Amino acid sequence: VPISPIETVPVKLKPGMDGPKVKQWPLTEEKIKALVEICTEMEKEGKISKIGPENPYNTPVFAIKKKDSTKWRKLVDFRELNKRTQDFWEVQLGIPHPAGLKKKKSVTVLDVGDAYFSVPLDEDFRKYTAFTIPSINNETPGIRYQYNVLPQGWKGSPAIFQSSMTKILEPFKKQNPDIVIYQYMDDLYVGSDLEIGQHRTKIEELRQHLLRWGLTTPDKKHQKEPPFLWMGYELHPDKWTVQPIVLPEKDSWTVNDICKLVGKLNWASQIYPGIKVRQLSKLLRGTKALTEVIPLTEEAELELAENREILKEPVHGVYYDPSKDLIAEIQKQGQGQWTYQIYQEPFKNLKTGKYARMRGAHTNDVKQLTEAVQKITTESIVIWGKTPKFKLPIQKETWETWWTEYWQATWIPEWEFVNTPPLVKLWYQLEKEPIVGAETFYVDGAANRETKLGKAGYVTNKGRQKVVPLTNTTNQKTELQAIYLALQDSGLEVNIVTNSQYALGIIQAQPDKSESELVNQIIEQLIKKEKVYLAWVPAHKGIGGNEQVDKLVSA
Amino acid sequence: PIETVPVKLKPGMDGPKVKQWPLTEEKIKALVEICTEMEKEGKISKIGPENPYNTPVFAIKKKDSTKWRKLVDFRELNKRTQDFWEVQLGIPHPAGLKKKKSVTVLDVGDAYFSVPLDEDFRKYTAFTIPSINNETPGIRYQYNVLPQGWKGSPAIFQSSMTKILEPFKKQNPDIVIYQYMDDLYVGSDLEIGQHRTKIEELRQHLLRWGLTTPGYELHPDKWTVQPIVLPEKDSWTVNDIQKLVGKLNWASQIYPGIKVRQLSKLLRGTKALTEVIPLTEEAELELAENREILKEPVHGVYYDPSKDLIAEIQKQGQGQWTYQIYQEPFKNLKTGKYARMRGAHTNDVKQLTEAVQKITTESIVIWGKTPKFKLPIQKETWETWWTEYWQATWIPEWEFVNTPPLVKLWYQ
DNA sequence: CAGTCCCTGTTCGGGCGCCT
DNA sequence: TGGAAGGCGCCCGAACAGGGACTG
């Protein structure tokens, strides 16, 4: 008879499936001595038992040395058990952010020791855990054991742990409504507005409560001592910061280098404002292998330079004060890159961040601004449960023009203009009505599917005309191309009739940037015009000169 | 006390697994309190990560309500229970409800809380309350009774419902009563006073039978249809005639009698857009004949109960929104326009949300079904804002379209 | 008409970062 | 050495998925 700590959690295998059978890795006696060591320890504590041949299951175990630590870390690879283990609904919905914590008089950070190992596994599942234990090389076939608790490396361990832990803490919290406990994995952040004494008291009460359930709180706890190391941050009484970020100086740059670099810069962007990853990532496009080594472009080097400069200065975030409004301000960084700062008191930042994403083949600054606002809103809701008041580099009138005229539903929540160039503008506006006294260009283009050869051209009410042969092209590109010609060959005010739905659809959305050079040139021309009216008519209806450019560009 | 009607999933279909979305603090608070009281009452009970299933939850306030209501997005669950409610225990739909001079909507969802739920089914009602800034992990529950907004719920409670109603039906033979999900729709031709009066009566009946009503008023005989119209101008330009022809061209996809030839003739040459051209007799004739065809009913369009309703919405600017409900392309069961809704001239998303709810409501009164929406908005835009504006206890299906308007067919 | 092509949006999987 | 879990973020590219015009 073994004893029973705390309520268990029913587990199962994906129906009609059975436990894992695999033999181990050839291992040095290094790893094996680092193993049998802690192997023989658990038996007494109750964290394992032994099995005969009765237990037809086999899984590997080998050890990895603790980072910044003395003793070795034992990790079982359950991958073949995981694959066959029931799916769980993960209760961990995201990572807490320092910027979302409120000011607290007294603060403590505790770890539950050997946390996974303090939680009873499920009775009838225990068997499936079976691994084989090495004496040493060539020595002995070994001894096979089974977990009575949650194994490091299973796939149900985190969820059951987090859920059980919650169940235990719940009553302590119901009795202490004013204490704040951030519970993340086995890490605990307790904080209170109590005086540091009554606080140390209540912390003790809590350690004892966790004890009643067999959960140990060793003295690796941070007691009064700021800064607390929590979730990769340092928490001081009035400020927080990221723990120092070491960027690689490597003279030779490979692909995986660029990756580690960018990942780190992204991590940094939560606090250091203005980080830019665009040029750097440009380097990673369509590469052969993670090992391949590429040189930095002038463009990438300049960027990396100003990021290292950004990183020169130390910076800190503050905490969140519900009595005060939330505020997010955005700056346009060029090339479709955006930065933002969320704060409450001017200049004291809760957090910062960036939005770089390019959506669509054709876009503009107003759309991308909208996208950023949404990214920021959702992020804000996760952290503070509310939407920031926005400060945006876009004239109120610009925005009113865009959202009212656009065919999609579009909206930004409460916001105000901040005049902080570069401002976001619409670069041209299509007329709502045909222009009196402007030359009307009936434009057309067509391509041959086989030859991929085509023509693009136009005819005018003034008798003006053009046709141009094009090679290796599409119907779409030629429709665009006809419009382009009409723009080039016309004065400052022009009417243009097209039967292309595609072409019209792109231009009417007033793009300022494209993945297509031809659309970019069309944009360039649209920006130079004073007045442009685009109109659509159906094809083959022999409409206007539109049958006569229709019969012109097939010729 | 009660015996639980067993329930199964549609053949060969796993339960719902849908990630909870972030909630605002006001909403998480309202949910934590609502749920606390519901647990004290045995209606739901806490569960654990062993249960693989999850459905999103959030909170809303009905129009003018001020009281938080819990709302579960059971759309996935319902799609996976579909044969149970459609085929087996389902509800017959009165074709007179749309004809009644007035129809009030009442929230009866509370009643579903009486009946136990099949024990082996509950694992599927799983939902997770999240926390601000991920302070705590998710608090998972599941329903021990009939959940509000599940399609199975008004099915299993049907016998009990008619049981409670039979007195009122006998008493008032003419009043029509429909049940859709958490709602009861009550129509009559009585004048408004008589009406509200009788609805209070029905309230009493529900109260003494063990239910509460914390309804909306509708007027279907007043519901309007939006025809396709052609402009009347004293003089026409090349551009006017081009727009007209493109419109008539699109229209013929619907009414095949439309003809563009006499009108296209006036467009023969390459002319200035702003140039005025007079209409030939043949063009005048073709045009008026066309204006007549657009008065006629479209041919061979009738509702088919076995088919889904699709609804399309267009943003017309200036607070105008046009829509069409259809089963087959170009056969429109209904067309409409809405103006000056909440959010007009200020919030597109709020107006769209309002429009989606009005349209869905008419769909329930008319066919007793909700349409699948084609929404003129970016997925992320809608998904960030919609639950802020949602005042209804059901959620329709939707997809997102981007459809520039070469022609404005549906609004002058 | 069914079947291609263009084209343009979405989703998914795989890499890195960071936490336990 | 080379090696486990779950969570969240980014960036890319390859794949699927669908609308609208042209063609057998």
Side-chain angles (χ1 to χ4, degrees), chain B residues 270-287:
Chain B
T270 308
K271 289 163 156 296
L273 292 194
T274 66
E275 182 176 306
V276 170
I277 86 212
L279 296 199
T280 63
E281 321 318 340
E282 311 315 327
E284 282 276 43
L285 157 70
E286 189 188 66
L287 181 48

Side-chain angles (χ1 to χ4, degrees), chain A residues 86 359 374 407 442 533 544, chain B residues 50 239 267 271 380-381 402:
Chain A
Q86 75 162 71
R359 281 204 156 205
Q374 288 148 187
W407 56 81
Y442 296 73
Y533 174 75
Chain B
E50 79 264 8
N239 175 65
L267 294 181
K271 289 163 156 296
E380 293 77 15
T381 303
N402 193 0

Side-chain angles (χ1 to χ4, degrees), chain A residues 54-79:
Chain A
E54 53 183 345
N55 218 92
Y57 309 117
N58 200 14
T59 37
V61 48
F62 58 68
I64 98 180
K65 173 78 188 317
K66 253 182 175 180
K67 174 70 185 65
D68 255 272
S69 300
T70 311
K71 307 285 187 163
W72 278 62
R73 179 176 180 79
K74 184 203 166 189
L75 302 168
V76 181
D77 173 308
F78 281 107
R79 193 171 323 182

Side-chain angles (χ1 to χ4, degrees), chain B residues 20 40 90 113 168 248 285-286 326 368 384 386 406 409:
Chain B
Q20 170 72 44
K40 172 175 189 179
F113 284 146
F168 202 58
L248 288 157
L285 157 70
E286 189 188 66
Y326 70 75
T384 297
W386 77 272
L406 340 158
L409 178 76

Side-chain angles (χ1 to χ4, degrees), chain B residues 330-344:
Chain B
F330 307 101
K331 304 283 162 223
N332 290 325
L333 300 177
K334 184 170 153 47
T335 67
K337 180 167 65 61
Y338 295 148
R340 268 174 309 279
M341 307 182 289
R342 57 187 195 115

Side-chain angles (χ1 to χ4, degrees), chain A residues 210-266:
Chain A
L210 290 184
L211 210 44
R212 297 180 53 189
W213 279 270
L215 294 167
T216 47
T217 56
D219 288 330
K220 299 301 182 169
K221 67 166 289 177
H222 324 351
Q223 184 119 0
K224 84 150 196 175
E225 212 71 351
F228 300 87
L229 297 188
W230 182 73
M231 305 301 308
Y233 308 107
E234 300 183 324
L235 319 188
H236 304 87
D238 285 86
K239 87 185 78 183
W240 64 269
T241 182
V242 291
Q243 295 177 7
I245 301 170
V246 192
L247 295 184
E249 227 105 21
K250 260 90 163 184
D251 52 323
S252 182
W253 287 108
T254 69
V255 161
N256 192 84
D257 279 18
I258 291 298
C259 286
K260 200 187 173 76
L261 172 67
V262 164
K264 284 192 183 168
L265 287 157
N266 280 341

